[model samples]
Structure formats: structure tokens, C-alpha cells
Target: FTSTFYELFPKTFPKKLPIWTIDQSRLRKEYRQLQAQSEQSSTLNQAYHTLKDPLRRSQYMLKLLRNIDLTQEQTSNEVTTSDPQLLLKVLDIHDELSQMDDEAGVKLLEKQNKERIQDIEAQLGQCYNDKDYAAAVKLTVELKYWYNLAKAFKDWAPGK
Candidate 1:
């Protein structure tokens, strides 16, 4: 469901139609809000993987899969909601997860841990690019170990 016109429209990629008009001011504000929401959502997603508590983490992941507002993607697609109440339940779990203070998990992303992940990922990318499947497989094995290590550290880290 993409529009076939100018690429000038910011939301033009994979655009849908019945092209409608917008209140520029309102639209601008909404876009900003969407951008902020997207950033926050992304942070929440990172926190999702880092969370140690199985129940809450599973709840958060379900919320993300069920009720996430992913419209901020550079592409757009319509997702039909089957059950509003169930969706709301997922949102509640997500909100509770958000309210919990897990600064170290967030800090792990912001400070040192993310760089380590990136280094491993870069090596993997290079391996893939060079068409070296054997080296790529080896790096992937190592990468999974780092990923597991990060999760364990996050699980044991301080705070609720």
C-alpha cells in the first residue's frame, strides 16, 4: 500500500493513499512526538533484552509484540487489532516494566557494553562481507557468547 508519487513526502516510502491533508502545525508536533516516542520505545526494547527477571521480561516482550506503536518506522503498514482488552493488558505490563528503575541496564547500553557488542558485530559483518562463511560462523559463535554474557550480567546487576 504505497503511494506512487514524489519521494518528497517524508512518509512517502511505502506510502499508502486516499491522500489526505494535514494541519501543518499539528502534524509537525505529532511528528516530533512520534520521534520521541520512537526513541523511548527503542530504549524500552533494548531494556527488554537486558532484563533478568523472567516474568517481567516476558511480559514486556509480549507487550512489544502485541501493542507496540511501530508506526515510526520509515515504512508504514496497517496492523489489525484483534482484541483491545488483551492489548491493554499488554500495555499495562509494559508500563509497569517502564516504571521500574533499572538504570544499570540502560547504562550498560549507554556506556561500555554496547561498544563491545558493536565490535563483535563489526567483525561478523566483515566476515560476511568477505564471503568467509567459516570465519563468520566462528565469529557468530563468539558473538552469541558475548550476548549471553551481557544478559547474565544484566540479570545479576543491582536494582529492581
Candidate 2:
């Protein structure tokens, strides 16, 4: 049932919900605490379902306790705060974090590409050493392809 539930709602539920842990006794304790808080049948049913499923428990915690919505993206452009400076600061921080993520992703991709290029270059050298001009020509074309692809995405790397 747990596997089926996870499979059905993989995006809605993370694989490791904070409600469940390696310690079975502590998990059971918390599960019981949630179950015990229910006063009415409707409440009990809700609690029971959440307690039985880690994904449901996570959703309950997020929606009820944390007052957060998992489905919504924080893309609101409206500045509703009295101190508009705070909103500007927040936006600046978000922009910085986004840039940081993009840079890290680009760096990772570049590192992988660098390693691949080195491997292909080594093969190209071997082909030249063996006097395999045709294979060496092919590897040169491949090298150009890689470089051109990288150049094409250079301008868009900031949004990576």
C-alpha cells in the first residue's frame, strides 16, 4: 500500500518525509501523538490517514502547522509590505540564490564536459599516432561540435 501510494503521488510526496525516521519506536510515538489529538470522527479519520502515510503526514504538517503550500511557486511580483525596502532586499537575496544555483549547475556541466573533451582528445591523439587520419578527422569534427554547442548556450548559461 505504501509503495502504491508513493508511486501514485511521487511528486506530491517526497521519498523521505520528516515524519518517518529510522527509529521505529520514535516514529510510532509521534504517529500515536497525532492520532490521539483527534476528538471527532472526521478529525480522527484525517489524523489516522496522515499518521498511516508519511506523505500525508508531511502535507498535514506543511498545510496546517507551517501554513505552506507545496503546490505553489513563490513567483509573486506584488510588493504588499509596508516597508518596501524589505521586499527589495528579499528579491535581491532570491536573485542571488538563483544565480548561485545556476552557477553551480553550469560549473558541474562544464566540469563533466571538460572531462569528456579530454577523453575525446586522447582518442584523437591515439588515432593520429596510429596514422588513422579518417578517425582523427571524425574526432576533430566531434570536438568542434562540442565547442559549438557550448558556445550556443554561453549566453543562456546565466539562466541554467
Candidate 3:
């Protein structure tokens, strides 16, 4: 698990939240590495890196935290990412959550007010299936926010 974590998340999440009891150690490591790599020698690199760190992910999620209704910042900011990278991260986080055996991951998902995120995902799939790219795009962003929110909680242990 530790080795796999090193494969997935960045180096900081596990080091920072070693006892989070969640399976995001790996995802955290991946995200951290990507963020660092994204920002190695540029300015927007910081902005892009902020998209992945747990602490930064937390602060970034604040936009969604205050309102589950899916705000403008949520839609415009994320949809800008090319679909392949965005979808890949979504699958990565989904797989990370699926690998967990208990409530830590799900509870964190729920606390983010996203218990029905998967349901929405299914609905979005149906929309896409029906050729409703408009609705699919809208729903896709909503799902992405929750996924991002859940990722934010990956290393969010209490009191640390």
C-alpha cells in the first residue's frame, strides 16, 4: 500500500497526514508530485499545483463547501482543463475510494455533501448516452467538484 501510495499521491499528504486512515496516501503523493512538477519553474505552475495538494485542495474546495449547488467558479475553473487529464484524475480518485474498505473514505465523501455524487455520475452518463452534451458537461463539472472535495479530505485528519 505504501509503495502504491508512492505511485499515486504526492509525497506530502502521507508525510503530513500519516494516520489519516484513508487510502489516499498514494493519491496524495501523485497529486503532490504533479503539483510540484507543474510549478517547478513558473507562476501559473503555482495555480496548477494548487489544484492538487490536500491543504490547497481544501482551500480550493472551500468554494464548493459553502454551496453544494455548484457555483460559477466551480464550472469555469475546472472545465478549462483538457478532458483527458480531468477524466484521468477522476478515475484515479474513484479507484482510490473504491480500494478503501470502510467508512473513512465514504464518510469524507458524504461530509462534502456528495453522497449522491455517484448517482449524479450515472445520470450524467445517461445524458451523454442520450447525446446531451450540454447536460453532461454541466453534470460532469458537478461530479468533478465532489471528487475534488473528496480528494481534499484524503489527508484531512482532525486537529492536523
Could you say which candidate leads in lDDT?
3
lDDT of 1 by residue, 65-87 (tens): 33332233321122214335534
Error of 1 at 28 (Å): 23
RMSD of 1: 16.5
lDDT of 1: 0.40
Give the whole-model CA lDDT for all candidates, comma-separated: 0.40, 0.44, 0.49
Score residue 119 of candidate 3 by CA lDDT.
73
For every model shown, what is its TM-score relative to the native structure? 0.30, 0.33, 0.33
Ranking by lDDT: 3, 2, 1
Question: After aligning candidate 2 to the native by TM-score, how far in Å is the CA of 113 from where it should be?
Answer: 1.1
Question: What shift in Å separates residue 120 of candidate 2 from its native position after superposition?
Answer: 1.3
Could you give the C-alpha RMSD of every candidate to the true structure, in order shown? 16.5, 22.3, 15.7
- Over 4 Å off in model 1, which ranges? 1-111, 157-160
What lDDT, from 0 to 1, does candidate 2 have?
0.44
